[PDB]
Structure 1
């Protein structure tokens, strides 16, 4: 069995972080998103993964995916292309897929969940896609805007965008499984699986929905990134080596208020308070009395004593001041440096900036 992960795309919603690295390689918790998906696929038994590489063809994706040496898995890297939409990469990779009898997986690099992959053995009952349109129950389906009408027969009647009537609560989950015959349907041009191939499959009656019992989150947005991290860390606390604690004696003496993920190589202050559902990257340095409430600290980032970053994302090589407050949903770029006492209330800072002014309202720092 083999999988195809759509690793292209410009990462527009995660823009301050995706101006440096592609969206699949943006670290979620303490690993890249695509790495979580590849680990799930390896747990399945999948050995071949095909990456649809359009954004950063060789500068980032090929070089940074040295994880092929680990994980006992190999990536094809034969879908280098110009932007071909969401469905075109499958048409391009038709040749490398060989049109074998065995079906193949399809995944997006923006989804996190328990990854129930027993949809391989299940849902083989005469489906063009064996429960391919995987769906999750979300009470906020109106703003998500992709509602899938799945009856008890699981035959997709239609796809509705922003439905006024309560047709259903299930929304697309971004995980698919296709028989290779679909390669005939996909044209060799720019197309979207969501808005071109899927309506045709639903009309033809070959599209079947698979329900998702566990948690699910599309983390392609900073708000969704934070909330999905909150949902995800409790699942992964016992999985990894990172009382009411996960890493309580890494550096000096500091307090942990709940689940978190602190890398072994990170030094965590003295008396700091690593809050619930917080991620600290490798080689990161945390000040004495910091408050890492719901923030993600990525790679070689340094945070000064007394800083309080909550529900915010800081970049890879930041140098945060001492007594700062980075609140709300604030995203910092690759090399942003913040002076002491600066308050950023949900402001997105582009890479390689220096912040020295208080920003009390959401905005963008060019």
Structure 2
């Protein structure tokens, strides 16, 4: 009888390859949590009970037992969506059968959306609406570059979907966070964007304008930019003069806001740059520069290295005086010798690096 939701995660994770080989794309950590745990937490803030995960391939990719978060938080994942090759309609194909006597509209979310997540949508748009909160929109500067403009007139109702419009109809873009009523479910074998054109034809499709940030985290560059946009929004959310985290293992300075895992050891004279994240049990040397970069799980970092606009693996062991900058992702259990300069090179897991790379490329 409790409120339920569906999350569309079906994909391969090909774009974010260099660090998705070890763990699936949904559960690659962002800031300090797996990429989906943010959405489960927001849906709990709504007050949902269980989440319907829609995986296109490898449903038993070790995710079931890796989901330790399932026992906590009082949220149970069923993993009931196994997809044969059909159209791009998750709920229509598999989740239509499983409803278990719902009573409230169920949310629909992507896996690469990062926002302030306004969780009043169940209560909002309740003023005698059929299919409340049917679509969610946000402002974009490039009205024509992204395309797919959802025109929102003065009335909170949408009637036309135009792709690459010549007219300046509006700056609204489909955020990808949907909520539909139970009656929406209709058996449509493979399908036109989940019957959105008809949904507007009966004129029961509403849009919610979003003031917060929005972007698709599908690439490492988008990963870094999402980090730099999302960190300032967490000032009232989590625990962490710039006092985001100042004294952990020694008297070190932080230029801007950053997320420092309490179990980590920063060192003595490190300079944690703006919008940086550090995972548990991470060790940072006596003097370091973590500038707009993420350090995930148990990693060791020597003395004097600079990690700028980059990521490191899970059990990665970084040299002492190296210099890692630009958009370069290091896979799992990588090791780099002293005094190496990796500039925008993605290394495969378990590799070893001992030579300079001044140009973008891949190390196998």
TM-score where L is the length of structure 1: 0.90
Q: 1:233 to 1:84 in 2, by over 3 A?
A: farther
What is the count of residue pairs matched by the alignment? Answer: 362
- 1:85 deviates by 5.7
Once the two structures are TM-superposed, the CA of residue 356 in structure 1 deviates from its matched residue by 2.4
* Pairwise CA distance, 1:320: 1.6
- Please state how far the C-alpha of 1:8 moved relative to its aligned partner: 2.3
Q: Unpaired runs of 5+ in structure 2? A: none
- Which digits, 9 at most, give the CA deviation of each residue in 1:51-89, with x for residues without a partner? 113344223321221212211222222113346564234
CA spacing shift, 1:83–1:257, aligned 2, 3 Å: farther
Residues 129/338 of structure 1: CA separation in 2 closer, same or farther (3 Å cut) = farther
Name stretches of at least 5 consecutive residues in structure 1 with no aligned partner: none
Give the superposition deviation at 1:127. Answer: 4.3
User: For 1:152, what is the secondary structure of its paired residue?
Assistant: coil
The residue number in structure 2 matching 1:213 is 211
Question: What TM-score results when the alignment is normalised by the length of structure 2?
Answer: 0.91
Superimposed CA distance per residue, residues 75-118 of structure 1 (whole angstroms, 9 cap, x where no aligned partner): 22211334656423442011212463421111112111111121
**CA separation of 1:51 and 1:277: change in aligned 2, threshold 3 A:** same
Aligned partners of 1:289 and 1:305 also within 8 Å: yes
Which deviations, in whole Å up to 9, do the C-alpha atoms of 1:325-365 show, x marking residues without a partner?
22222222122222222222222222222222322233333
Three-state SS of the structure 1 residue aligned to 2:250 is: coil
Change in 2 beyond 3 A, CA 1:342/1:194: farther
3-state SS of 1:52 partner: strand
Is residue 6–residue 86 contact of structure 1 (8 Å, CA) maintained in 2? no
**Which among 90, 114, 117 is matched to residue 115 of structure 1?**
117
- Structure 1 residues 341 and 140, CA, compared in 2 at 3 Å: closer, same or farther? farther
Distance 1:96 1:61 in 2: 21
Structure 1 residues 304-339: Cα deviation after superposition (integer angstroms, max 9, x where no partner): 211111111112121122222222222221222222
1:218 deviation in Å?
A: 2.0
Q: Given the superposition, is the C-alpha separation of residues 308 and 69 from structure 1 closer, same or farther in structure 2, using an over 3 Å criterion? A: same
Q: 1 CA distance for matches of 2:360 and 2:160?
A: 38
Range that drifts further, 220-229 or 55-64 = 55-64
Deviation at 1:44, TM superposition (A): 1.1
- C-alpha change, 1:324 and 1:141, in structure 2 (3 Å) is farther
Inter-CA distance 292–99: structure 2 relative to 1 (3 Å threshold)? same
Which residue number in structure 1 is paired with residue 130 of structure 2? 128
Q: 1:361 to 1:169 in 2, by over 3 A?
A: farther
CA gap of 1:86–1:61, structure 2 versus 1, over 3 A, is farther
Q: Per-residue displacement from partner, 1:11-51 (whole Å, max 9, x unpaired)?
A: 22222222222222111100012101111111111112111
Judge which range, 21-30 or 87-96, deviates more. Answer: 87-96
For 1:119 and 1:187, locate their aligned partners in 2 and report how far apart those are by CA, in whole Å.
29
How much does 1:144 deviate? 3.3
What is the Cα-based RMSD across aligned positions, in Å? Answer: 2.3
